[PDB]
Amino acid sequence: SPQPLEQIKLSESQLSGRVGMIEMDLASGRTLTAWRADERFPMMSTFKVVLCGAVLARVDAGDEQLERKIHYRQQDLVDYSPVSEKHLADGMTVGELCAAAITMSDNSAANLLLATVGGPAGLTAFLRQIGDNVTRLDRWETELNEALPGDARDTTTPASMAATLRKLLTSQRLSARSQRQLLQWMVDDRVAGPLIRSVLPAGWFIADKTGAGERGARGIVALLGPNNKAERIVVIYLRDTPASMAERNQQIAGIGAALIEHWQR
Ligand SMILES: OC[C@H]1O[C@H](O[C@H]2[C@@H](O)[C@@H](O)[C@H](OCCCCCCC3CCCCC3)O[C@@H]2CO)[C@@H](O)[C@@H](O)[C@@H]1O
Ligand SMILES: *C(=O)/C=C/N[C@@H](C(=O)O)[C@](C)(Cn1ccnn1)[SH](=O)=O
Numbered sequence: 001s002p003q004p005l006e007q008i009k010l011s012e013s014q015l016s017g018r019v020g021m022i023e024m025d026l027a028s029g030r031t032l033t034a035w036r037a038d039e040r041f042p043m044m045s046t047f048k049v050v051l052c053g054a055v056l057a058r059v060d061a062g063d064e065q066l067e068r069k070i071h072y073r074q075q076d077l078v079d080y081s082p083v084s085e086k087h088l089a090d091g092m093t094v095g096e097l098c099a100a101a102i103t104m105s106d107n108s109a110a111n112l113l114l115a116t117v118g119g120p121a122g123l124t125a126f127l128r129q130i131g132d133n134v135t136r137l138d139r140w141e142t143e144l145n146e147a148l149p150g151d152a153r154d155t156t157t158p159a160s161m162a163a164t165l166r167k168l169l170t171s172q173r174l175s176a177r178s179q180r181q182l183l184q185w186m187v188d189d190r191v192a193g194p195l196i197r198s199v200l201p202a203g204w205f206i207a208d209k210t211g212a213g214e215r216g217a218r219g220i221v222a223l224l225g226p227n228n229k230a231e232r233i234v235v236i237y238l239r240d241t242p243a244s245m246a247e248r249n250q251q252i253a254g255i256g257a258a259l260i261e262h263w264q265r
């Protein structure tokens with residue numbers, strides 16, 4: 001593989017699209033390498049990780065319980081609800097909703113949860129309170145994946161998403177059990193985890209959340225590192241390319257490959 005930024009260029013040139021990337025130490029926030037890290041990109045389903053971060057914050061403040069059962073109707077469902085569509089009679093706990101939303105990318109589960117923290121407004125307030133002054137959620141599923149050119153709604157920057165995930169996973173913002181729960185959800189991803197784990201070299205830890213949207217929007221936020229440890233946060237977004245999903249998948253894999261092959265101390 002080529003060096004990581006060389007691979008990143010090649011990808012932008014082949015896709016005719018923008019790539020954004022940061023590789024950061026989870027423990028300190030040391031930035032190892034970055035590319036359009038301060039440019040905005042639609043978050044897509046990657047926001048589900050931050051959303052469950054806010055739910056955990058509510059559980060920690062005594063405002064919410066992972067066990068609280070929520071009951072919802074058929075009329076509340078939205079597109080792609082592989083888990084939530086199966087529990088119309090029995091409802092789902094707040095904890096199950098976060099696992100469906102992060103590990104299966106269930107969209108109704110995300111919506112039901114979004115209502116509990118005050119909707120997109122309330123999730124943007126939580127970010128501001130955590131010191132993220134860039135990320136902004138403004139719409140619900142599935143409209144938040146719309147990705148129009150130059151629209152800042154429902155977008156983040158690579159470096160702002162990395163700094164926020166680091167704060168949720170390691171500062172004293174979430175209790176320790178909550179930090180561990182947020183982490184375990186991403187480890188248990190069922191959409192791309194297994195696939196990715198199977199092609200990674202032996203020794204590599206992987207936790208992730210992937211997303212896709214319109215106009216070629218594609219992305220992943222992940223915990224990765226050699227020696228079976230969640231060493232660094234890697235955030236890769238792609239936007240404004242006409243390419244097929246398969247090509248978009250391969251290009252992000254090729255950058256991931258480059259990143260992994262040329263990993264620095
Ligand atoms: O780094 C050296 C290694 O190079 C090869 O592995 C390749 C290759 O087998 C590939 O499949 C994979 O990435 C493929 C999948 C990348 C998916 C990453 C996408 C996500 C991953 C986590 C966040 C970044 C983006 O890595 C490497 C690096 O060249 C193998 O020889 C392996 O034995 C060896 O240990
Ligand atoms: C996370 O990224 C959820 C988005 N997926 C979209 C998509 O692939 O673009 C689906 C198909 C739902 N949706 C959003 C916009 N249009 N449909 S699905 O994965 O929920």
Ligand SMILES: C[C@]1(Cn2ccnn2)[C@H](C(=O)O)N2C(=O)C[C@H]2S1(=O)=O
Pocket residue numbers: 079080081082085
């Ligand atoms: C999620 C699904 C229905 N679907 C499509 C769009 N929104 N919902 C359906 C299900 O589990 O309900 N699954 C299949 O069966 C394959 C997948 S799916 O992607 O066909």
